[PDB]
Amino acid sequence: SEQSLNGRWTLKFFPQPAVPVMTIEGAEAANGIVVDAVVPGNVEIDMEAAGLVEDPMVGNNIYKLRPYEGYQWYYSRTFAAPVVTEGQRLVLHFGGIDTFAEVYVNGIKVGSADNMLIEHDYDITSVVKEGENRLDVIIRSSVMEAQNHFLGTLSIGNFSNEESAPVRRAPSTYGWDIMPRLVSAGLWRDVTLRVENPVTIVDANWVTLSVNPKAREASESLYLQTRLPFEMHDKVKAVITISRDGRQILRKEALMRKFANLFTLNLSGVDAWWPRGYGEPALYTAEVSLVDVTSGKIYDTKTSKIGFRTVKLELDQPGQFQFIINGEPVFAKGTNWVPLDALHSRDASHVEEAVQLMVEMNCNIVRCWG
Amino acid sequence: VSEQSLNGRWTLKFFPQPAVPVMTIEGAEAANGIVVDAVVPGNVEIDMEAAGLVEDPMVGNNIYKLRPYEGYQWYYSRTFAAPVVTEGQRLVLHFGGIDTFAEVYVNGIKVGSADNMLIEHDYDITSVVKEGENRLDVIIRSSVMEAQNHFLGTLSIGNFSNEESAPVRRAPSTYGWDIMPRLVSAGLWRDVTLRVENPVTIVDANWVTLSVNPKAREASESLYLQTRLPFEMHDKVKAVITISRDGRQILRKEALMRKFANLFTLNLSGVDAWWPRGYGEPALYTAEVSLVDVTSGKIYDTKTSKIGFRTVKLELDEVNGQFQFIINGEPVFAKGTNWVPLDALHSRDASHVEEAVQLMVEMNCNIVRCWGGNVYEDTHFFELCDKYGIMVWQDFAMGCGNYSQRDNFAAALEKEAISVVVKLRNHPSLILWSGNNAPNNDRVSRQVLSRVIYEFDPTRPYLPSYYKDPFYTENPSQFVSEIGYHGCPNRETLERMFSPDSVNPWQNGVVGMWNDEWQTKANRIYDDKFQGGRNDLMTNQVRIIFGEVPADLDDFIFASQSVQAEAMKFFVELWRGRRPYRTGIIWWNIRDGWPLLSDAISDYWGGKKQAFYYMQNVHHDVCCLINPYMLKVDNNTLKDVVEVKDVASGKQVFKGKFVSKANQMSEIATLPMQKGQGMLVISYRIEGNEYFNHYLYGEPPYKLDQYRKWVKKCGIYE
């Protein structure tokens, strides 16, 4: 189960004082403006929906957002407590927080975020009560956080802003030659509530050792790590299924003796993955599940789509290399991937349109710019 | 000044570990469990077997019954008397081995948190100790569940070592291997004492031999002395250094302590060099350091240990095991055994050290590589190696595979590496440190461990990492380290390992098919029912070298120990035969650590196999042997007749004198190719003492009954 906490929140913004507000009391006692926010979303969208700011995409209205870089942002909402049996763990997942933020649940701090580029998972099993819970996030100024660090000589004078060096944020958000200075802020990705049984898959890392497209075979290894209580050892099996279009190709069951195992599979009758031009992008649904060998109850499932391919950069001056996919030297033709939107919360709505631009132009490679 | 032993009768309370691990005394006392009497040092399985709760894990498939106890907690508890402590003294609670993750409490106050089973743990309980009954509580938690507190890498999953052994600092073999079963266990597996230290005391006395002239009987010995010394005692304490041997005194030097740390150099005279077994005598000298008050003459602390004047250098050739050991400036040939666990229940390792070291003495081993999968043997083990002359190749405790590259693991490994090096850097037997790994981009083997040796031991070299087929006779590895060959143990051992209804190896009389009880003793880590695997290596060797399977169990025992004896004897004869080029050979297992089937030449209960006596005759200091014929003698000493004859026909193949030069392989004469499957005897006498050997010539398959009578007419062996 994964109940989504996306929707309408309550955002309160105010200039950041000399001491950044980091508690729910200081935020609720400050002097600011309270508007309705949308999660996922940026704070510029929430203020634009209330007429506080003008459209930054028209003319010189982008500089009119400059004073908001030294503002704080107070998200708030209420959520019902999901049914949690004893032994399960309730996790509050954050797809993205821009950036330095202090998360609170029912008045108790449940973590401190310091990066907008990675996820943030918080175990809130004990703090969640019965009924009306409250989730309050308090973001501070990402620009002012750069002054908490002393920079070196080489970190000053670059085209990237000196404010971007001591922090972990997207360098283009501070302005570049192809993207504007819209530092922005806010929960720009999904916020959900995942449940975790005492037996739950931690990671399912698929690796392609060798591939043989001619013989239609490939060696696929699976590195599985799981949280398995010892009272559940030797009582749970792992079901590995690799199918394609409702057609199963592999079904292997193995008893969970250890908590981490390497399951090397020798697939038969499977096509290799190829870039555009060099063949078909053969994908296979690879689903893993931890099922009780007695009650038959499935605890956790991790499904994905993998491709039997091998990569090997062949070197010999910048650029003296060639990609070798599946043993054949391929000629790369593609574009660099830049930000899809200065307000990165809308990148999910533009990814489908932008990828179509590459399909239409038949690009085999794409370099996601740093 | 005082060391009260806390060994003896304890109170062990074990219970299934809940979701939240028990950390405090209140939770352990309120938990529902079973309480029995425990013995320290001792494993928890020994304390449960003494109460009739578990059956003997050494017999049958009962090793799998200790599986649920891997997720159990263990609550040791006792009371001790508090010794009187004067002003400035400190009371140290010394644990010799905590297995593994435990919380130590003294009078309800947490004094330490142990997370390593391979090093010692000292806790100053000077303040928390009261008068009367002083409670001591050690609450251990599961080592298997602790592996889930980490996120492993890709290169740390799927190796021979268990994935539970990667994040923790324990012995990898305790989780399962090829020659040791899965017995993780727990408990205070070493001594627990109460040491009292004066304000003036010796923290460490590191002895290092700088120069050795073994001919002129001279040596230069340095002492890096670090002491705890209050400033009021400065200029009032003197260091007394005494070098003695067999009661007589050689050197005595006194120096006033003006600093807490000093380097004392000693140009000794009339002393002998410590040579390995064969190349000389293991000359040991008792070295003693004492801190004495310059006015009252009171002794504050004293450290006594036997040292050996020796220098070690490893000349490695790389591309161009391509190294050669140099001891005291002379190239030595290394021939010895790899040391594996002496017991899956490691608390009983101490009782087996005396017996197992003598096995290398009768084998005439001059080197022994302590396998990385084994716990660090205590000081008493290295003391026997100093006494006899058996060099040590100590591997850091890491199994076959790679480990974490992050700061958390590297810091926990440096703490263990420092504690181990400082503990063993004063024994002349220890000659080399190694990581037991695979590569040159590994932080563990190329940075963390190397930096510890660079600072705490700059004297010993460090390293990061059918039988006549061309895989063995053409391998260009000058220094081989893991050569093995399977062999079935003695009958008396089989009758004790297996139940009476399973002493016979064959299932339903079908030869080649092993029953489940033989499959488990072949080191089956888990209860996975399958046919074949490792035990098929015993049948594969008997079929090729002797034709097919001997249905008679005694005929199969004789066949299995003969294919192992003839193989590894041919390996020692091949490395000693190609000596000018070969640098050393270290075979696998001279004593296993559990009732199991392995490549060992001797089982756990002491049953020496035929490969023991075979390799003895090819391990003398001066040994005559035949290689594919070529009769040659190899000499493993620094000190400068033979009769070959067929056993059946009795015709003298060759007779004559020989001059075996020191530390050199001297070839004798080329023998003619005798037709027919037979056997030769190599009788040679040196200095009035007689010695015997043999050489089996021909080509397999052979006949078991014919070979049984060849060695009978030989006179050597049964």
Task: Write out the DSSP string of B375-433.
Answer: PPP-HHHHHHHHHHT-EEEEEPS--SS----SHHHHHHHHHHHHHHHHHHTT-TTEEEE
- Elucidation technique: X-ray
The greatest distance separating any two alpha carbons of chain B, rounded to the nearest whole angstrom, comes to 87
Tokens representing residue B620 in the block = 């003398």
Residue pair B29/B23 in contact by the 8 Å Cβ criterion: no
User: In the sheet that A191-196 helps form, which strands lie side by side, from edge to edge?
Assistant: A2-4, A191-196, A89-94, A120-123
State how far Cα A270 lies from the chain centre: 30
Contacts of A221 in chain B (CB under 8 A): 158
Of the partner residues A229, A233, A258, the one whose CB lies closest to the CB of residue B163: A258
Contacts of B664 (CB under 8 A, 6+ apart): B579, B580, B635
Contacts of B396 (CB under 8 A, 6+ apart): B372, B417, B420, B433, B434, B435, B436, B449
Contacts of B528 in chain A (CB under 8 A): 257
The last residues before gaps in chain A (C-N over 2.5 Å) are: 316
**H or E stretch including A361?**
helix A347-361
The last residues before gaps in chain B (C-N over 2.5 Å) are: 320, 438, 465, 628, 640
Q: Which residue has the tokens 């597996």?
A: B189
Taking one residue from A and the other from B, the number of pairs with CB-CB distance under 8 angstroms is 50
Angle between helices B536-546 and B553-577 (to 10 degrees): 80
| Of B634, B641, B717, B622, the residue nearest B679 (C-alpha) | B717
- List beta partners, residue A262: A223
| Of A262, A265, A304, A311, the residue nearest A284 (C-alpha) | A304
Contacts of B705 (CB under 8 A, 6+ apart): none
Q: How far is B71 from chain A (nearest CA, A)?
A: 6
| Of B377, B394, B347, B341, the residue nearest B592 (C-alpha) | B341
Exposed (0-12), middle (13-18) or buried (19+): which is A29, by Cβ within 10 Å?
A: exposed
| Cis peptide preceding B172, ω within 30 of 0 | no
Q: Is A125 on the interface with B (CB under 8 A)?
A: no
- List beta partners, residue B654: B644
Look at the alpha carbons of B195, B199, B203, B206 in this order and tell me if their dihedral is positive or negative. negative
| Of A325, A328, A321, A337, the residue nearest A370 (C-alpha) | A337
DSSP state string for B634-651:
EE-SS---EEEEETTT--
Tokens representing residue B1 in the block = 């000044």
**H or E stretch including B584?**
strand B584-588
Instruction: Compute the distance between CA of residue B593 and CA of residue A296 in angstroms, rounded to an integer.
Output: 40
Contacts of A87 in chain B (CB under 8 A): 19
Q: How far is B142 from chain A (nearest CA, A)?
A: 9
Distances, alpha carbon B666 to alpha carbons B179, B624, B689, in Å: 37, 10, 20
| Of B34, B20, B37, B239, the residue nearest B145 (C-alpha) | B20
Judged by DSSP in three states, A269 sits in coil
Residue pair B28/B140 in contact by the 8 Å Cβ criterion: no
Q: How far is A261 from chain B (nearest CA, A)?
A: 6
Q: How far is B164 from chain A (nearest CA, A)?
A: 7
Residue pair B682/B715 in contact by the 8 Å Cβ criterion: no
Residue pair B384/B353 in contact by the 8 Å Cβ criterion: yes
Residue pair A284/A303 in contact by the 8 Å Cβ criterion: no
Q: Is B152 on the interface with A (CB under 8 A)?
A: yes
| Of B682, B660, B686, the residue nearest B671 (C-alpha) | B682
| Cis peptide preceding A40, ω within 30 of 0 | yes
Test A230 with B142 for CB contact under 8 angstroms. yes
State how far Cα A342 lies from the chain centre: 17
Q: Is A229 on the interface with B (CB under 8 A)?
A: yes
Instruction: Compute the distance between CA of residue B93 and CA of residue B4 in angstroms, rounded to an integer.
Output: 10
Q: Which of residues 243-272 of A touch B (CB under 8 A)?
A: 257-262, 264
Tokens representing residue A316 in the block = 């010999």
Residue pair A40/A9 in contact by the 8 Å Cβ criterion: no
Instruction: Compute the distance between CA of residue B243 and CA of residue B287 in angstroms, rounded to an integer.
Output: 5
Instruction: Compute the distance between CA of residue B237 and CA of residue B240 in angstroms, rounded to an integer.
Output: 10
Distances, alpha carbon B6 to alpha carbons B21, B25, B44, in Å: 27, 20, 17
Instruction: Compute the distance between CA of residue A205 and CA of residue A224 in angstroms, rounded to an integer.
Output: 7
Residue pair B374/B283 in contact by the 8 Å Cβ criterion: no
Residue pair B103/B110 in contact by the 8 Å Cβ criterion: yes
Instruction: Compute the distance between CA of residue B31 and CA of residue B199 in angstroms, rounded to an integer.
Output: 42
- CA end-to-end distance (rounded Å), chain A: 34
| Of B184, B189, B187, B158, the residue nearest B171 (C-alpha) | B184
Which residue from B minimizes the CA distance to A200?
B148
DSSP state string for B296-354:
T--EEEEEEEEE----EEEEE-S----EEEEETTEE--EEEEEE--S-SSGGGGHHHHH
Instruction: Compute the distance between CA of residue A182 and CA of residue A177 in angstroms, rounded to an integer.
Output: 13
Instruction: Compute the distance between CA of residue A146 and CA of residue A127 in angstroms, rounded to an integer.
Output: 32
Q: Is B147 on the interface with A (CB under 8 A)?
A: yes
Q: Is B581 on the interface with A (CB under 8 A)?
A: no
Resolution in angstrom units: 3.1
Distances, alpha carbon A59 to alpha carbons A48, A51, A63, A130, B244, in Å: 16, 17, 10, 50, 94
